[PDB]
């Protein structure tokens, strides 16, 4: 189950905030953070280096957001495509606590144990992805192959270091597990978007 990460142990998650904190996403490169598209709102800040979210304690950076790009094939209805870019107005100052997460070259298997994290001090689910039918018997005709369930919104699941996932959807029911959007489907899209941005 959940615990608490320990400060800045994930420095790749980022948290976003317009005012308050309303979702994570994860930190690809200096200029970019990949998030849920049922995040999309305006007057981003991204927050960079947190712990506790109500408190500075001193290894923060607060960017804002320059542009928002939500997956052309976005279904809100369905939370298929649940996937959007948010480039930084400035690049961020990479550091220790501060850090990148790389992109998959492929997907990754039932059975392997992923890191889910989010929001306060930032919370950790260790985890293993659940196979394809456990998945889909959880929730009838709601799982696409752009979906896959283990056991905040927006936020990563890594899985070998590897981004994997991002926090989707899940509801409160006892047997139901989380829903993450399938990263390794969008690498193409991720890298072309923001190489053109």
């Not at 904190?21 to 690809?28: E, K, N, P, T």
């Not at 304690?57 to 052309?72: D, M, R, Y």
């Not at 752009?146 to 990563?156: I, W």
Request: charged fraction near 10%; hydrophobic fraction near 35%; aromatic fraction near 8%.
């Amino acid at each position: 189950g959940g615990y608490t990460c320990g400060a800045n142990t994930v420095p790749y998650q980022v948290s976003l905030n317009s005012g308050y904190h309303f979702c994570g996403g994860s930190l690809i490169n200096s200029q970019w953070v990949v998030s849920a598209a049922h995040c999309y709102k305006s007057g981003i800040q991204v927050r960079l280096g947190e712990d506790n979210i109500n408190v500075v304690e001193g290894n923060e950076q607060f960017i804002s957001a320059s542009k928002s790009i939500v997956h052309p094939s976005y279904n809100s209805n369905t939370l298929n495509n649940d996937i959007m870019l948010i480039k930084l107005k400035s690049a961020a100052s990479l550091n220790s606590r501060v850090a990148s997460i790389s992109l998959p070259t492929s997907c990754a298997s039932a059975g392997t144990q992923c890191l889910i994290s989010g929001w306060d001090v930032l919370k950790c689910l260790k985890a293993p992805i659940l196979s394809d039918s456990s998945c889909k018997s959880a929730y009838p005709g709601q799982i696409t192959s752009n979906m896959f369930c283990a056991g905040d919104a927006g936020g990563p699941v890594v899985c070998s270091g590897k981004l994997q996932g991002i926090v989707s959807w899940g509801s409160a029911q006892k047997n139901k597990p989380g829903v993450y959007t399938k990263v390794c489907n969008y690498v193409s899209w991720i890298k072309q978007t923001i190489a053109s941005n």
